[model samples]
Target: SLLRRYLDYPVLWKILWGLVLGAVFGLIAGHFGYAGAVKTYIKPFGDLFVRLLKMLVMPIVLASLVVGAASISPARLGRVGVKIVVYYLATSAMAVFFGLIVGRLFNVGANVNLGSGTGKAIEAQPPSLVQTLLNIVPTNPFASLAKGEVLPVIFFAIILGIAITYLMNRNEERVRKSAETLLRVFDGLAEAMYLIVGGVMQYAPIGVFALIAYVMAEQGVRVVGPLAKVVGAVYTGLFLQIVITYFILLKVFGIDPIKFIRKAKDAMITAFVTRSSSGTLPVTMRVAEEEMGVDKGIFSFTLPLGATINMDGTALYQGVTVLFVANAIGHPLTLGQQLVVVLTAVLASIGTAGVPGAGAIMLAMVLQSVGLDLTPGSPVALAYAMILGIDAILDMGRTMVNVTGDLAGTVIVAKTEKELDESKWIS
Candidate 1:
């Protein structure tokens, strides 16, 4: 009986245990001055895991997106792009909007009399219409692939994919063979990458435990009460965003939200622990494609785009942090400034979508938007220093929103595109 039950346990449980035990171990390191060892030695194991995923990105995105494209109808693919935009434009605004109202309502950072730190000064102004389009299109796609410019990679893949379809449509046998030949090679490469990702994840719990332990040990500092409220409020926003948006889609479209979510634990837990959406890209993309049975055609594009564009958690945090910092510094935020914060957060998030280490920069822009400059020992700067303390812990929670939203949209889009493998989706 015990062996039977043991065999029945999902891999997610092991990963979750790894998260818990690693934190506990890291906490022990905090006591013994071994945290550095954990970071120095153990950290590489986890870091290597992410690097493994990144190693495959260029090949997978190029191959998968183009291969995926050749499979979709022109009309449906058009709609898929629109759906992605529709979700980001609407949900992102909602993230900031709900974040503000939730902040005010919950009294998060309402008592602004907290200390601003004497920490060092930190540093996107808003993008214009032209700049927005430029951000959407890659100037040189080959450069984009090299630099890991996500949306540009997807855009280039789409064009090449569609071109393949056009060539395949021609009556000439030579042209069709040429198109299919290239498409098959890339498809094989993408498929091979997925296999590598799946294999890498087989030992994920060990890496997750090490990464979480090392990071948690680094976070030996305490969270003051006001900072605690901000983090709690963030989790609150994240929960609502996932439950409301994701569940609604599942319920309406009729996927068993529970089962899909159950299977997605692998992705969710990895995101929660990793704190990097891009780092967790392979997990989400692989699970959705191979295990959950979403067409590679769909996730190849959506998952990458989501990683780049869908910062629902980050957008919400920006809005709340602006209010928190403004309130902390005794800067009375005007209604106009509040509106500006929400809009700017949504836009700033999209514009800076794939930029790594962007949380602080994005936060600075939001604070500046409301007429406050954050420098050392200033009220805003001090508040941010306090923020930097808990941010690593906070990053873990927020990354899940991007992954959750992506999984939801992919299912809906696949269903509409007739790409959904009903048995596999439900599996």
Candidate 2:
């Protein structure tokens, strides 16, 4: 009954009111020149929210991937694993490329010169794409994990999870006793982190209120204006990916996009507000199995994998983020390093899989990979902090896209696997 009560409420309405109330109140504070007071009293809630999200994200990724890896049973699902993975990889690459194009066309970060250019210009000399991939293999496992070097950590996690397949090896020790053990251990850990994130989200409205107010109060329209463009560009790219790209993909397989979306509406809204595909699993599974007519077997296998490794929204965010952050710092991306942005973003996303506020964590990895500082308050790092401030707003859109893509993939794979019960889709 408690779960039912919470579920029945529209969570987005509260987030919406929080933004409106915070913006109105903050604007008033700015107009009356109470910016200093708002700064002293209001900004901490937002800062802590960002800090907590960052703190929880890493461990979530680690456990979710391990669970996801261990959860993969090729013998059970057959080509479902292959198809789901191929779908994710192909779509994720396209998502990254599309985002890069939109960010460039809009020049989302081109005009801002917020930070001191104390950060070295990676634009001058950049590594080859080959070296960038090679660099993903960490020299020091401890250093990689400790320093939050995202690529290595994820690279290792996927491999370690994949290694769990050794348990399914010819000897077949019931699919790696340790991998089975790790799956349970990590699933439990994932549960804990999800609850922690849920607790952190309870304060999001106040945090978003403070952070947004601080931006309006401190920078007035100047800061808010460019950020508006950056957000516009992000949504624009998401539009193409969701409507044009994903819609077309669905149609190719005989599923009507609009009708499919209607069936999946509840899951979409849940994904948007929760901002965690991992958190939205139950609803996603429901829509897939009942609404879209995907078999439970298919949804269970593919959705978990999608939740962990797909990351369409996040991959796109990273590509745009590199260009956007560079624009903010007044360092333009070179042609070669823009290649670096695309490649690194895709990898950064895979590394931080299943983490709530995933875009935020992946954004940090993408920025740092390109030499941007995310230090909270330094002049050189202020721009990144500002971007982090609006992250929750961005996240709402990002998670919806991630879920949409996952469902779309399920439909396509189901058609191939013949697991879809099309009659169920009608009701």
Candidate 3:
């Protein structure tokens, strides 16, 4: 009855009103402005919500991946894991390239003249893909566990799942009962988290308002002027990528993109407001399983992996930003430079994997590679600072695209595995 009541009433209403009020307040603050006192106090309320969402991320990934993997046959699990990695790699590359092509064609950064030539730049610590791959083994699994290292955690979970499946396979019925019992328990835990997230969401509008107020208050509206075209073009390209590229992929995989979009509205909305993939993971997991009819195992492994490492949106943003900065500095990017940007963006995405402020940091790396100055206190650096204010706002849209790509990959993989429930998918 309590659960039924949760389903029926205050939970949904509170979330809806919160979002509505937050949007209203954000618009007002953005227009009329908020005092420093208001901005300081209100901002943490939003931060607290994000922290709560993050607190659950590592555990959810471990539990869901372990539970999901253990449910599948070991042979099928290998195939699914391979497919997930391949899909993420392929799409992330394409996303960066799309940003490059759009940025160049529109010349989004042509007018961003900061007038200071080749300023001092920050040196970025380079990443080794080879080392990253090797590090997946986790020298000390428990240390990795304590540190919340995603790759190692995923590695450990897969091994644990295979071991569990092996045990289950040897004694079929007992394993089935045990696995089912564990799944039911996890399902309950996941559901409880969802309810908690729903309750927390009631404050989202207020959070959003504070976030926008702080951004507008600090930057003023002038920051949008010079790079508006670049922003517009990037968003336009993002839409095309979603509608054209993703839609076509969905059709080939026999999914209705429209239906998928409709069902994904809640996750998309949450991602847009929160702008942190980790923050939006719970909602993404819910939509992947319930609306898309993905096997919980696939959803758990792929979605978390995607959230941490699968940054299609960020990859795209890096491409655009690199080109914009290049153009602004009166340095024409050669064909080779363009290629490097695309490659660097793809590589940097994988390297930065779980790092915070990943987009800006990655962009700074790309700029440094091309001999551009992005250090703070320089004019070019100030331009970057200007963009940072609006980054969260723009990130919201990109996060949705990233999540959609994750779902699309899951749908394709599920269909290939024959684990998708077509009745549920269509319904």
Candidate 4:
């Protein structure tokens, strides 16, 4: 029974152990000159895990959102949708504030020399706001679906679902029957996708292991030496936001933060290792539904929406890095300029993809907003070079925070709508 019980242990513990062992093996490999082995041999399994998770995103979003949107009344849908968007925006703004305050207190980049910015220029052009908003309409829904364009796909799915709901309520019996049949089809498809997600999760520990092992083996902890100050500031800000903001929200909504984190750690840790919120979507959705007891209708709509726009972590990064660059260039931001950074970061996060390296791109835009020249060889650009060197390390923590905020928002909204299953949630 002991062996059997150990075999039946929680998936969270298995995944956590994978992470711990991966780090241990990775440190050994890196120190002993076998890092290449990890990259060549172990990395592919991690890639496969990410690919499998990505493979499920489009179908899961389309099927689940359509069924979810159709399941709720149009009025209730509007209320819930607004509630989540507003919550996301408010939290993002708060995160940015935390970053700025933390960065100032930590005085990141002060007295640090990043050398001349002679490195190759990093290109991450900011799209116009009008274009980003317009892009959500999806001129071709099929193309959007095929390309895994999440925002447009979300728009189409919700509209289609709402249309089905309207048709289902019509007086004509045949039309109502046909619409009902269509809704049932998507509902069944969504259920099927969840089953597939459940199967995918069984491989998560192995995937997490390979990912951490390969990363630590290849890059080791040596990269953090020069940028430790900024790193500490950014992480401190992340800790505050999660500990203070998310904790209060959970308590105010009557959800036990302890229980919520216990169930949600699987998704959070996976996000930290993989550094891709989009890639981690399958796991996040599964945990929210199966473990956290959020109803499918709410989570399907909220989780994807959260992934795309909820960049509390990135927004926070912007605050810290902008201050870091400014201090590095000997031109610290004024109060007015800091305010601009907050607004720009919050807006930039709206259309930004939830993947690795997005924070750097968003940072570029935030840097440009306050009149910092990022052309090669500028002081600001030199400091940016330092940031690029350590971006991967910074990404892991921020992405974890991003995913945590998503789950937190999902739980709050679910509780508000009375869609959360209390028995399952606390179990």
TM-score of each: 0.56, 0.73, 0.57, 0.58
lDDT of each: 0.66, 0.69, 0.62, 0.74
Tell me the lDDT of candidate 2: 0.69
RMSD of each: 11.5, 5.4, 10.8, 11.4
Error of 3 at 406 (Å): 1.0
Consecutive 10-residue window with the lowest summed lDDT within model 1: 116-125
**What is the Å distance of residue 93 in model 2 from its true position?**
2.5
Query: What are the clash counts of all predictions, listed in order?
Result: 2, 3, 2, 0
Q: Output the worst ten-in-a-row residue range by lDDT, candidate 4.
A: 114-123
Q: Show the colliding residue pairs in model 2.
A: 109-327, 167-175, 167-176
lDDT order, best first, reads 4, 2, 1, 3
- Per-residue lDDT tens digits for candidate 3, residues 1-427, read 8555544543323333443354455456656666565457765665554444345444544554465455443444477777887777688888888888888888865765654455333334433556545765778878877775555655676576556667655547877778667656755664554455455444433443444444444434333455577678668778876787778878988888898788788888888776667888999999888887888877888887677557788878877777776666556666655665665555445423232345654565566544464432234443444444345445666787777778778878897889887887664
Q: Evaluate model 1: give its TM-score.
A: 0.56
lDDT (Cα, 0-100) at 253 in candidate 2: 80
Highest lDDT: which candidate?
4
- The residue ranges of model 1 lying beyond 4 angstroms of the native Cα positions read 1-77, 112-223, 353-356, 375-377, 425-427
Query: Which candidate model has the greater TM-score, 3 or 4?
Result: 4
Error of 4 at 107 (Å): 1.4
Q: What is the TM-score (0 to 1) of candidate 3?
A: 0.57
Name every residue pair that clashes in candidate 1: 116-382, 117-382
| Clash count, candidate 4 | 0
